[PDB]
């Protein structure tokens, strides 16, 4: 009779509309819940050894592995009228390795740049070294550096694509072999010397310890650099600012290879300890089922995983849409093992040590895997 759906307070209008849908199509009453997402499922784990949990909620991809592996999620089935690709299922397959989550949503970083500034979207990165040529981009307050291009390469999450697209990979088996990390591998590190080749000709300003954003930010609305690497989050923020921005997919590598970003997203998952386990199945299949997934694009502007959805999206015609989906056929998944979290600082911390000369880029690389292996093993 009833199913509880526990959501972001974004969610709201889609749920809604959703619920009266599926009210009159199946005979139950879908009540939503709004709330915080993340925060929902960190009060999960102790939430299933009671079942005061909600019937159906979001999770992000790593999100699906991490608490899949961990006994809090109960399995999904994939039907075929969730249209998942290999690439999908591969995004809610555990390390064990059943299904944890049906896919909702897919997302990765995109290129944003100015149209007054140029005309056309820059196909590869030897474009963008090209525009750090020009003088009027040069950066007023120190020389001789420009603003023609910016990322935020002491960001792992930014940085990944580079790394990866030049060879690198956190862990092996497509993130599954904890004992062999690639982070310190040829193509990581003249990833990590082709960022520091930019940082030598950026605003020192870029190899700020937190706020490298807010300056990346600050100088494309401004309108003093041509493309920056960002995600759809951004995307208002620029409109906001009446900028006249376009967007395609990251420019190729030097070396020919795509940048290979993290492939991000959202599955509908089920609680463990959920009170029917059907009833839920249920109505997480009419979630990803081809006219919700379409209704949860027109709804919010998130790409939709379904790959029929996915097509109506792409048919809108929008930059931004099409973008995500055109560079989501080349991203990598985001290792969802909980080794993952031992990642995160010791990379970030490489990428500092590197741009900033502390450390050359084979030894800042090394120290980072050998600081991850360590944290490992101390498990």
Do not use: C, H
């Not at 526990?6 to 849908?21: F, L, M, P, Q, R």
């Amino acid at each position: 009779k009833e199913l509880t759906v526990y959501v972001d307070e974004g969610y709201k209008s889609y749920i809604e509309e959703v619920a009266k849908a599926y009210e009159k199509e199946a005979g139950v009453k879908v009540t939503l819940k709004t709330g915080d997402a993340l925060g929902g499922l960190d009060k999960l784990s102790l939430d299933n050894q009671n079942g005061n949990v909600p019937d159906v909620m979001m999770a992000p991809y790593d999100r699906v592995g991490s608490l899949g592996s961990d006994g809090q999620l109960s399995e999904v089935k994939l039907s075929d009228g969730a249209k998942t690709d290999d690439t999908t299922k591969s995004l809610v397959t555990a390390a064990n390795g059943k299904v944890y989550g049906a896919p909702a949503v897919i997302e990765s970083l995109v290129m944003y740049y100015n149209k007054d500034l140029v005309k056309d979207a820059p196909k590869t990165f030897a474009d963008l070294e090209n525009l750090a040529k020009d003088s009027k981009y040069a950066f007023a307050g120190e020389d001789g550096k420009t603003t023609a291009f910016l990322a935020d390469w002491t960001n792992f999450y930014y940085t990944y694509g580079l790394l990866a697209g030049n060879g690198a990979y956190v862990f092996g088996q497509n993130g599954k072999d904890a004992k062999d990390i690639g982070l310190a591998n040829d193509g990581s590190i003249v990833g990590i010397n082709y960022a520091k080749s930019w940082y030598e000709k950026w605003p020192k300003g870029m190899q700020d310890t937190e706020g490298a954003g807010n300056l990346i930010q600050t100088q494309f609305q401004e309108g003093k650099t041509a493309a920056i690497i960002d995600g759809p989050w951004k995307a208002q923020a620029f409109k906001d600012a009446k900028v006249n921005y376009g967007v395609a997919t990251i420019p190729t590598l030097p070396n020919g290879k795509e940048y290979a970003a993290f492939g991000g997203g959202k599955a509908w998952v089920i609680p463990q300890a959920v009170k029917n386990l059907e009833a839920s199945q249920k109505f997480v299949d009419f979630l990803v089922a081809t006219e919700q997934q379409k209704v949860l694009y027109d709804k919010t502007n998130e790409i939709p995983a379904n790959t029929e959805a996915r097509s109506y999206a792409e048919g809108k015609n929008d930059e931004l849409t099409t973008a995500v989906i055109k560079q989501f056929k080349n991203t990598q998944p985001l290792p969802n093992i909980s080794q993952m979290s031992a990642v995160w600082d010791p990379a970030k911390n490489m990428l500092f040590d590197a741009v900033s000369g502390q450390k050359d880029a084979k030894t800042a690389a090394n120290d980072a895997v050998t600081l991850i292996k360590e944290t490992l093993k101390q498990k």
